[PDB]
Symmetry: D2
Subunit: 90 residues, 4 copies
């Protein structure tokens, strides 16, 4: 049920195009009705496991239709760590 | 289409309870009709993006029903990606 | 030269005793004269490559002398990279 | 003291060259007198913490002098719970 994802996209085809495709994945993510915090290396999402897996998949499909080679680091979590940290406030 | 997923499950639970969530995730994974290689830190899967996302979600649900706190590192590689055989011929 | 480390420590210990290795790694990190931001899943450091590698090693040695099993995820970004600030508003 | 490292260099550069900076880092790594296994997403090294930190730093400096933007994922393990030595099965 309760879960957290930390997503890092890394397009490896063009130039910086790249901060474009990332920007895209970011725009898509903002579109979802999910709690999100953009940190320096990854975008942290919080919500129901089911919705995050769905959003993760879409986020990657978005990135993949902007670059031919997409690599992503993903962190998935469930309980006991932190949501307190979520405090963007910056 | 083409996609590769690397999975590492780090359950934040004691001894015996963890060797089980890990055993369970591996067994489940073997159950799928997907190309898989178990390496020292992560289990590497290869196949269609759609099926891997599905398998990833199930793998995590399996792990989550064996421990209350499950953390996972996942690597995704989508698009015109080289195969496990090709990468291994760096 | 310019570099950025993203540090995440998972102690693999039982409650109270782990959330001590983490306060230990955070405290040590604050001790260094390095730019640092604590995000939900990892602590992001920014500075000279040489100093970060040194701080990373010490941070891990600190964690290791508080738990017998320490696992860490680390992200290294070195070169004509974008500062944390620039990435902030990606 | 006893430790294990998992390295993944993502040069985020235009095709071909990306496997060149990766091959570079690989050649350097083979040069060290350290136990190593190349898996599909990361190269796993095993040995004394001190030597691995030294090798990691050099590996990255090698990669950085072949591309202007180098990103790396690194996993560090200290202990035995995850029995990384089992990597005899390569």
């Amino acid at each position: 049920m309760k879960a957290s994802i930390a997503l890092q996209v890394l397009p490896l085809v063009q130039g910086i195009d790249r901060i474009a495709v990332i920007d895209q994945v970011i725009a898509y993510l903002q579109t979802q009705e999910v709690t999100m915090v953009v940190t320096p290396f990854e975008t942290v999402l919080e919500g129901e496991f089911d919705e995050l897996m769905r959003i993760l998949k879409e986020a990657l499909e978005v990135a993949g239709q902007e670059a031919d080679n997409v690599f992503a680091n993903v962190k998935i979590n469930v309980g006991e760590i932190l949501s307190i940290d979520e405090k963007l406030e910056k």
